[PDB]
Amino acid sequence: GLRHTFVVADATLPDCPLVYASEGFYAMTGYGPDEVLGHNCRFLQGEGTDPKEVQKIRDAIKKGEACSVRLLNYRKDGTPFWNLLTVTPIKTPDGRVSKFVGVQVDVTS
Ligand SMILES: *[C@@]12=NC3=[C]C([C])=C([C])[C]=C3N([C][C]([O])[C]([O])[C]([O])[C]OP([O])([O])=O)C1=NC(=O)[N]C2=O
Protein backbone atom coordinates (compact mmCIF):
# COMPACT_ATOMS: atom_id res chain seq x y z
CA GLY A 1 0.00 0.00 0.00
CA LEU A 2 0.82 3.71 -0.01
CA ARG A 3 3.06 5.02 2.75
CA HIS A 4 1.05 6.68 5.50
CA THR A 5 1.16 7.51 9.19
CA PHE A 6 -1.48 7.52 11.87
CA VAL A 7 -2.24 9.40 15.09
CA VAL A 8 -4.96 9.72 17.69
CA ALA A 9 -5.97 13.01 19.27
CA ASP A 10 -7.96 13.14 22.51
CA ALA A 11 -11.01 15.38 22.07
CA THR A 12 -12.01 15.11 25.73
CA LEU A 13 -9.14 17.55 26.30
CA PRO A 14 -9.94 21.01 24.94
CA ASP A 15 -7.03 21.44 22.51
CA CYS A 16 -6.99 17.94 20.99
CA PRO A 17 -3.59 16.66 22.13
CA LEU A 18 -2.05 13.68 20.40
CA VAL A 19 -2.11 10.57 22.60
CA TYR A 20 -0.82 7.97 20.14
CA ALA A 21 1.33 8.02 17.00
CA SER A 22 2.47 5.25 14.67
CA GLU A 23 6.16 4.60 14.23
CA GLY A 24 6.12 6.14 10.75
CA PHE A 25 4.78 9.41 12.11
CA TYR A 26 7.88 9.79 14.27
CA ALA A 27 10.14 8.57 11.48
CA MET A 28 8.53 10.99 9.01
CA THR A 29 8.54 14.13 11.16
CA GLY A 30 11.81 13.58 13.01
CA TYR A 31 10.19 14.15 16.43
CA GLY A 32 10.05 11.58 19.19
CA PRO A 33 7.25 10.68 21.61
CA ASP A 34 8.77 13.03 24.23
CA GLU A 35 7.96 15.96 21.93
CA VAL A 36 4.72 14.72 20.30
CA LEU A 37 2.51 13.15 22.95
CA GLY A 38 0.45 15.65 24.91
CA HIS A 39 0.81 18.35 22.25
CA ASN A 40 -1.47 19.61 19.55
CA CYS A 41 -0.44 18.54 16.03
CA ARG A 42 0.00 22.15 14.85
CA PHE A 43 3.66 22.22 15.94
CA LEU A 44 4.32 20.71 12.49
CA GLN A 45 3.18 23.97 10.84
CA GLY A 46 5.40 26.88 9.92
CA GLU A 47 5.96 29.87 7.72
CA GLY A 48 4.53 28.61 4.46
CA THR A 49 1.48 26.81 5.87
CA ASP A 50 -1.69 28.11 4.26
CA PRO A 51 -3.96 29.70 6.91
CA LYS A 52 -7.09 29.10 4.83
CA GLU A 53 -6.52 25.32 4.98
CA VAL A 54 -5.58 25.41 8.66
CA GLN A 55 -8.91 27.16 9.27
CA LYS A 56 -10.67 24.35 7.39
CA ILE A 57 -9.42 21.82 9.97
CA ARG A 58 -10.13 24.13 12.92
CA ASP A 59 -13.77 24.42 11.87
CA ALA A 60 -14.25 20.73 11.11
CA ILE A 61 -12.88 19.80 14.53
CA LYS A 62 -15.22 22.25 16.30
CA LYS A 63 -18.15 20.89 14.29
CA GLY A 64 -17.09 17.28 14.88
CA GLU A 65 -16.91 16.57 11.14
CA ALA A 66 -14.42 14.68 9.03
CA CYS A 67 -12.03 16.72 6.94
CA SER A 68 -9.30 16.37 4.34
CA VAL A 69 -6.73 19.10 3.63
CA ARG A 70 -3.19 19.29 2.31
CA LEU A 71 -0.72 21.28 4.39
CA LEU A 72 2.87 22.37 4.19
CA ASN A 73 4.59 20.90 7.22
CA TYR A 74 8.11 21.01 8.60
CA ARG A 75 10.26 18.27 10.07
CA LYS A 76 12.24 18.76 13.28
CA ASP A 77 15.22 19.70 11.10
CA GLY A 78 13.15 22.47 9.50
CA THR A 79 12.82 21.04 6.05
CA PRO A 80 9.33 21.14 4.53
CA PHE A 81 7.10 18.44 3.21
CA TRP A 82 3.57 18.30 1.88
CA ASN A 83 1.19 16.51 4.23
CA LEU A 84 -2.12 15.15 2.94
CA LEU A 85 -4.11 14.98 6.15
CA THR A 86 -7.49 13.32 6.70
CA VAL A 87 -9.07 13.70 10.16
CA THR A 88 -11.98 11.51 11.23
CA PRO A 89 -14.08 12.11 14.37
CA ILE A 90 -14.81 9.16 16.64
CA LYS A 91 -18.08 9.47 18.54
CA THR A 92 -19.46 7.71 21.59
CA PRO A 93 -22.99 6.24 21.33
CA ASP A 94 -24.38 9.46 22.88
CA GLY A 95 -23.07 11.43 19.86
CA ARG A 96 -20.19 13.13 21.71
CA VAL A 97 -16.77 13.22 20.01
CA SER A 98 -14.20 11.32 22.05
CA LYS A 99 -11.22 11.14 19.74
CA PHE A 100 -10.00 12.43 16.42
CA VAL A 101 -7.95 10.08 14.28
CA GLY A 102 -5.70 11.25 11.50
CA VAL A 103 -4.11 9.66 8.45
CA GLN A 104 -1.09 11.69 7.26
CA VAL A 105 0.46 11.09 3.83
CA ASP A 106 3.63 12.75 2.58
CA VAL A 107 2.64 13.71 -0.97
CA THR A 108 5.78 15.66 -1.89
CA SER A 109 6.12 12.95 -4.62
C1 LIG B 1 -1.60 17.20 12.06
N1 LIG B 1 -2.43 16.14 12.19
C2 LIG B 1 -3.57 16.22 12.98
C3 LIG B 1 -4.20 15.06 13.39
C4 LIG B 1 -5.36 15.10 14.13
C5 LIG B 1 -6.02 13.81 14.55
C6 LIG B 1 -5.91 16.32 14.50
C7 LIG B 1 -7.17 16.37 15.31
C8 LIG B 1 -5.28 17.50 14.10
C9 LIG B 1 -4.11 17.47 13.34
N2 LIG B 1 -3.44 18.61 12.92
C10 LIG B 1 -3.90 20.03 13.18
C11 LIG B 1 -4.03 20.76 14.51
O1 LIG B 1 -4.07 19.84 15.57
C12 LIG B 1 -5.27 21.66 14.46
O2 LIG B 1 -6.42 20.86 14.31
C13 LIG B 1 -5.26 22.66 13.29
O3 LIG B 1 -3.99 23.28 13.17
C14 LIG B 1 -6.35 23.74 13.42
O4 LIG B 1 -6.35 24.32 14.71
P1 LIG B 1 -5.63 25.72 15.02
O5 LIG B 1 -5.84 26.08 16.46
O6 LIG B 1 -4.15 25.60 14.67
O7 LIG B 1 -6.28 26.78 14.16
C15 LIG B 1 -2.29 18.45 12.15
N3 LIG B 1 -1.65 19.63 11.78
C16 LIG B 1 -0.49 19.55 11.04
O8 LIG B 1 0.06 20.58 10.68
N4 LIG B 1 0.02 18.30 10.70
C17 LIG B 1 -0.66 17.15 11.07
O9 LIG B 1 -0.16 16.07 10.81
Tab-separated table of C-alpha atoms in Angstrom, residues 4 10 18 26-27 36 48 51-52 56 58 60-61 64 67 81 87 89 92 95:
chain	number	residue	atom	x	y	z
A	4	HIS	CA	1.052	6.683	5.496
A	10	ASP	CA	-7.965	13.136	22.506
A	18	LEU	CA	-2.049	13.676	20.398
A	26	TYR	CA	7.882	9.791	14.274
A	27	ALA	CA	10.140	8.575	11.484
A	36	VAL	CA	4.724	14.720	20.296
A	48	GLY	CA	4.532	28.606	4.462
A	51	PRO	CA	-3.959	29.698	6.915
A	52	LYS	CA	-7.088	29.097	4.829
A	56	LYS	CA	-10.666	24.354	7.394
A	58	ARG	CA	-10.125	24.129	12.924
A	60	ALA	CA	-14.255	20.726	11.112
A	61	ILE	CA	-12.883	19.803	14.530
A	64	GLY	CA	-17.087	17.278	14.880
A	67	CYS	CA	-12.030	16.716	6.940
A	81	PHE	CA	7.095	18.440	3.206
A	87	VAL	CA	-9.067	13.698	10.163
A	89	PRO	CA	-14.078	12.111	14.368
A	92	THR	CA	-19.465	7.710	21.585
A	95	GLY	CA	-23.069	11.426	19.864
